[PDB]
């Protein structure tokens, strides 16, 4: 029972572009009508309006579900085996751990790459849009919440439960995340550079969807060796661009491909950490096989 | 400096080491000059000329009362998430003599020609001929990448490290940490 030369898994939890604007903390109560920040030239640079001390970022998130369900598979036996393994894993334990990690990541400002640097107050607001109506909202503090430590909270647990349900396919889930970071008047934002050209949509600065989903998927915390760096964006071969080092090398047994091949062909269930990493990769999706 | 504060920049995936160190130094700059104090200075203990880096940690040499308000200040704090910071510890009695300073110069002939023509009211050709190709000079030492309103891309930071000496002359330092003409404790 060999593998399929063609294998692909559609990504799940795919967010959209994040629009950016500027305003004052006093106007946080009614963000409506906040003027946007337009890119300007000096290279290209983007600065907040003449009188604006707080930056605002708004992005939506959808939960499709069926992570384990493969999109395309050459062999039927492999697809059935994968679906069976996924059902068994879900029955044994639910995705509540991944959902909890995602909830913490969304609550904190880990997503912001350069905007978080030099932020005195970062307030995140995650709403829930169901049938076009805001069913339930949540407001957290990225600064108060530990960046390198995971703490339990009623709101975080509720969000993790909602995410787990959406992933399991209970119902459509839409979450509108809006962050407000205090930087300073006339400060310089660090939007996503384009191939100096700054990324701008509708004459408004924004961050790439993939660039946001990369940080949002920082669920890989089971690496063999930890130097205190913290969570690393889930990527094959545990590659890191900034650090320039790739953890979880293929020589070891922690490799995603090796773990999946063993747990599929030999039915060898690896440690809970390895299983979590494998499920995270399957949720993120990609191209495997040949 | 009766109290030494060691700020160790913890590795982070979201930001690179150069950008992280640059942001830390910039944030500390406003947290010290604006905060006041008679002597404010920092040194790079990890400084190495092989990698041409600025070091993975910094040591701020200041008095006890000065550090009491410096660490307590919100501006100098709040970055404990990406940086591991401890408490003041008495520095060892033996210390070397080193003075860290900054070099201020312009490497663009156009800026010099403009500055010259804007004083004596000269012509364009008069300012161009007066600025030769031998007036462009810059430090070749390791310069960290700092991106700010000065330059869109990463701008070099000119940092001069004083040679190790025996006699160490202390004294009041600059507001931004520039060399005031005296060495600092090396330990």
UniProtKB/Swiss-Prot annotation, chain B:
Mutagenesis or variant effect for residue 102 to A: Loss of pre-crRNA cleavage, still binds crRNA
MF GO annotations: endonuclease activity; RNA binding
Effect of residue 29 to K: Cleaves pre-crRNA 130-fold slower
Null allele phenotype: Infection with phage DMS3 inhibits biofilm formation; disrupting this gene restores biofilm formation despite DMS3 infection. Normal biofilm formation in the absence of phage infection. Loss of production of crRNA in the presence or absence of phage. Disruption of the entire Y.pestis-subtype CRISPR region disrupts crRNA production but does not alter phage resistance (possibly OLNs PA14_33350 to PA14_33310, plus the flanking CRISPR loci), indicating this CRISPR is not involved in phage resistance.
Active site: 29
Highest taxon of the lineage: Bacteria
Consequence of substituting residue 29 to D: Cleaves pre-crRNA 910-fold slower
Keyword Zinc-finger: no
A biological process term (GO) from this entry: maintenance of CRISPR repeat elements
Effect of residue 49 to A: No biofilm formation upon phage infection, no crRNA formed
E.C. number: 3.1.-.-
Record carries keyword Plastid: no
InterPro entries per UniProt: CRISPR-assoc_prot_Csy4, CRISPR-Cas6/Csy4_sf
Keyword annotations of the record: Antiviral defense, Endonuclease, Hydrolase, Nuclease, RNA-binding
Outcome, altering residue 49 to K: Restores biofilm formation upon phage infection, crRNA forms
Residues annotated as site: Substrate binding: 148
Subunit structure: Part of the Csy ribonucleoprotein complex with a probable stoichiometry of Csy1(1),Csy2(1),Csy3(6),Cas6/Csy4(1)-crRNA(1). A Csy3(6),Cas6/Csy4(1)-crRNA(1) subcomplex is also formed.
Assigned protein family: Belongs to the CRISPR-associated endoribonuclease Cas6 family. Cas6f/Csy4, subtype I-F/Ypest subfamily.
Function: CRISPR (clustered regularly interspaced short palindromic repeat) is an adaptive immune system that provides protection against mobile genetic elements (viruses, transposable elements and conjugative plasmids). CRISPR clusters contain sequences complementary to antecedent mobile elements and target invading nucleic acids. CRISPR clusters are transcribed and processed into CRISPR RNA (crRNA). Processes pre-crRNA into individual crRNA units. Absolutely required for crRNA production or stability.
Miscellaneous comment: In this bacteria, Y.pestis-subtype CRISPRs do not confer resistance to phage DMS3 or MP22, but instead are required for DMS3-dependent inhibition of biofilm formation and possibly motility.
Name assigned to this protein: CRISPR-associated endonuclease Cas6/Csy4
Name of the coding gene: cas6f
């Amino acid at each position: 029972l060999s593998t399929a030369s063609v294998l692909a898994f559609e990504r799940k939890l795919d967010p959209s572009d994040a629009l950016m604007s500027a305003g004052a903390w006093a106007q946080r109560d009614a963000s409506q009508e906040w003027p946007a920040v337009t890119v300007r030239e000096k290279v290209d640079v983007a600065n907040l309006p003449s009188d604006a001390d707080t930056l605002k970022v708004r992005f939506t998130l959808r939960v499709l579900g069926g992570a384990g369900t493969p999109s395309a598979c050459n062999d039927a036996a492999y697809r059935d085996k994968l679906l069976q393994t996924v059902a068994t894993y879900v029955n044994d334990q639910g995705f509540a751990e991944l959902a909890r990690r995602y909830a913490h990541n969304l609550a904190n400002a880990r997503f912001l790459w350069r905007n978080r640097v030099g932020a005195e107050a970062v307030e995140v607001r995650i709403n829930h849009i169901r049938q076009g109506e805001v069913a339930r909202a949540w407001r957290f503090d990225a600064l108060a919440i530990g960046l390198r430590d995971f703490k339990a909270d009623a709101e975080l647990d509720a969000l993790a439960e909602l995410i787990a349900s959406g992933l399991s396919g209970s119902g459509h889930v839409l979450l509108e995340v809006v962050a407000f970071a205090r930087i300073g008047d006339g400060q310089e934002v660090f939007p996503s550079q384009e191939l100096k050209t700054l990324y701008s949509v509708r004459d408004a600065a924004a961050i790439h969807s993939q660039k946001i989903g990369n940080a949002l998927r920082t669920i890989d915390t089971w690496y063999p060796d930890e130097d205190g760096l913290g969570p690393i964006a889930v990527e094959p071969y545990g590659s890191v661009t900034s650090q320039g080092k790739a953890y979880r090398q293929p020589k070891q047994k922690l490799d995603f491909y090796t773990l999946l091949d063993n747990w599929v062909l030999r039915d060898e269930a690896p440690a809970v950490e390895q299983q979590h990493y494998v499920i995270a990769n399957l949720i993120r999706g990609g191209v495997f096989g040949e | 400096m009766d109290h030494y504060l060691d700020i160790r920049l913890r590795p982070d995936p979201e930001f690179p080491p150069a950008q992280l160190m640059s942001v830390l130094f910039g944030k500390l700059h406003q947290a010290l000059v604006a905060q006041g104090g008679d002597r404010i200075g920092v040194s790079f203990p990890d400084l190495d000329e092989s990698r041409s880096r600025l070091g993975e940690r910094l040591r701020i040499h200041a008095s006890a009362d000065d550090l009491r308000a410096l660490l307590a200040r919100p501006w100098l704090e709040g970055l404990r998430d990406h940086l591991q910071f401890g408490e003041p510890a008495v520095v060892p009695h033996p210390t070397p003599y080193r003075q860290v300073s900054r070099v201020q110069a312009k490497s663009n002939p156009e800026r010099l020609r403009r500055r010259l023509m804007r004083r004596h009211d000269l012509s364009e050709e008069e300012a161009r001929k007066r600025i030769p190709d031998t007036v462009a000079r810059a430090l070749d030492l390791p310069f960290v990448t700092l991106r700010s309103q000065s330059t869109g891309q990463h701008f070099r930071l000119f940092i001069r490290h004083g040679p190790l000496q025996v006699t160490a002359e202390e004294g009041g330092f600059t507001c931004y940490g520039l060399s005031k003409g005296g060495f600092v404790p090396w330990f």
